[model samples]
Target: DHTEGLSDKEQRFVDKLYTGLIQGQRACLAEAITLVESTHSRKKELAQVLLQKVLLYHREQEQSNKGKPLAFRVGLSGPPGAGKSTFIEYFGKMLTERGHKLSVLAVDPSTELSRDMNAYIRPSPTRTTNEAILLCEGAGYDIILIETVGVGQSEFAVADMVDMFVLLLPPAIKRGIIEMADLVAVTKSDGDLIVPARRIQAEYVSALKLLRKRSQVWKPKVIRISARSGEGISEMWDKMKDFQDLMLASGELTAKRRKQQKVWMWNLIQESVLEHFRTHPTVREQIPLLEQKVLIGALSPGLAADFLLKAFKS
Candidate 1:
């Protein structure tokens, strides 16, 4: 019964996933993502098959002079409760209103408020971020907004994956995040917070001047925005457009994407090798005991790692 049940439904699911993606069907897009993220072996196999199809489709489109579909990948990072989602919702709605399609890859799952438009929002857990971006690219969105967790240090990976890294700040500043951002947005710029927001903006302007620039073509801009009142939203969008124009003209955008692709490939290779080493029969069996030995100082960590590596090879 199980075998018979899977045969028909599985084929249909794969067919729908490929067809819906080409047709830009949102529901099918969501379902395809669920399939890709599934842990079941059969589903995982199907997901890879579907991804191959999508990749081929994209390649064909490029070869036919259809002009490679360009999706501006924007990375957003900040402190928790610094208004990343609110900024995204407001910014996304504006893009959709102007007849542009956008995809949001959030670190957490949230309700979709713009069901009537071309924008799609999906939660992207840490491990799935790269896959989600590729899926969005294949699905033909014009822009991809990747919102990373607000925590510091862990977000550095985003810099390698996106065209621009935007750091959102509250009235209080975090120097570590500010140092890495291409653009710093001070949120809650309206109402009683206006004075404090301006103060924060001035501080970042001075601070950014002291830090070395990421690029000669473009310097980081500090701007204030109020998502609640929709103030400064249009100006922010204009700045992003300006940045894109400059990057494209200087050929930096193409270079950046090419470099990122190479980095992504190496990262994947490293992860695969590490996974294989961890799952090797001898290494798997010995890891717990070795870890315990090292933890209790009965064995040095370096020697324990050497033992594991030798065991893995054998």
Candidate 2:
């Protein structure tokens, strides 16, 4: 076993979860997500152990399969009413019918199964979704979709975690996170909405012409689609595949993922440090009082932060 120094209990835990995860056993796979999502100390460490074994097997496959991760992770983000769930419903079926093992994470309670072949696990947007992505990939899903279902800041976080970042851009087209899209879907093109959706697509087509080249290789592709009528869904999907193929051929996808791996490491460290600082015995005792003082203008925010840092160090 790769996991040495384990009690029989822990060894058995790794063996069971690791077997089911790599084999794509649905119930066992679901349990893997729950384990990764677990916060209890015992489960937390066990989760790490299980992930290590899963990652090892995943790495072995990557080594033998021409040096790439096993799955393509696509992240779709939009505020409510952008028809993300609707789009995924049809789009996911489209992919599944074509032999892609699709796995969806997050963005709804309304995501009823079409065939129950793939997995859909739910949670609020957070760092855990990255772990969930890894778990799904370990479960042998070839194509993974994540509906970021988030605010401005949260979508930014999700962007770093996906291979292809798509924005289900509604008519509003706000600036901050739209800049992150690899592809933009102007959704709900059925009925009278088609005109506005067409209008948005045209606007983005020329508008992206002036946008800076973030990749220096590819620009965001925009398409209008109706999840209701299924119009343009195939073309939209084509664009997504074009992106993956182009990036893979150009060697940019591997580059981006390698960079993301490093950033992923630092992001975990950053979160852990913030948690540790906040939970310090001295720092915890002083946080409320310091924040109250800052709120009332009794102390400057900078000085209050300084006091907390000193308390943490002390």
Candidate 3:
């Protein structure tokens, strides 16, 4: 590391963070994510430029001959009581001992993140979710685990962001996410849950057959795993590799990555636009106005949508 001296200190800030960050410094990784997490207007400019460098440089790494090994992104979405902490505890431990570095990015519509020393953990805000994932990827963690806190809407979005989406469920399950999940795991297979867990995994196995397949080369899968006995712990990681391998082999993995990149572009527009649109003018007033009209028979939603669309123009 070279420096031109005190004159360039302010200019030195971004480079300082960039090198510290990609070198896998824990404190640097946390600071980089905080930059991504803050929604305050003025605070984000440094974050914007810093994140841009990480993206460009990390992409550069992949194409170069001896680039850092690729990182895998997987999302674990489940309900609040689903034992995510315990499941992640065991799975993360297994991978780290196998000589893999893991990063777990959690979107908790709930609260404090349960910590693990072996994996980099971030309980991120909604808007910065993808940015957090990238920062973790930039840190050279071999497995990037994106975890979800709530039920319905967000799980499918996780499905969109990850190469594979694994839904962690309690003995009995949630319905709609089954359609979105590429792999399903029944948690607590050792406790009193021992009996019921197998039933649920088997039940989903049969149920999964009825739905149209999500991929041509791969089939969605299910397994019952106990953190207590560690049964299926090895199998769980094996199953994930199988999904990742099959998808990569069929060329579906690249296709998914490419398409998600475009889908995210509009979403990036919508996210920034949403914050600005709601912060000033008619947009704030219109939510309640539109809410009334949407629930009432007096106005068509299509008409109300267009009304707000024009309101955003000025």
Candidate 2 vs candidate 3: which has greater lDDT?
Answer: 2
- Model 1 spans > 4 angstroms off: 1-12, 63-69, 108-112, 282-314
**Local lDDT at 110 for model 2:** 31
Model 2: residues with Cα > 4 Å off, grouped in runs: 1-6, 107-114, 119-125, 171-173, 270-314
lDDT of 1 by residue, 1-314 (tens): 43333466777878778887878888888887787788787886688778778878777766675553367889898877888878887888789889788988776432444574688888655555666777777787889888887646557877778888888888643667777788888999888999999999998899988998777799999999999998888998888988888887888887888898788778867986997888888988999999999989899999998999888777
Total colliding residue pairs, candidate 1: 0
lDDT of 3 by residue, 1-314 (tens): 35222335534776888899889888899888887777775447678778889889778878783542388889888877788888787778778778888888877665122354557876556567778878887888778888887667767678888898888788853567788888888888886878899888888998899999879988888988777788887888888889888887788888998898888878988887888877757878887879797788878889887888898885
Model 3 regions lying over 4 Å from their true place: 1-10, 65-69, 111-118, 270-314
What is candidate 2's TM-score against the reference?
Answer: 0.83
TM-score of each model, in listed order: 0.83, 0.83, 0.81
Considering lDDT, where higher is better, how would the candidates rank from best to worst?
2, 1, 3
lDDT by residue (51-158, candidate 2, tens digit) is 888778889888888786689999888878888878887887778778788888874333555455764545543657778888888888998788866448778877
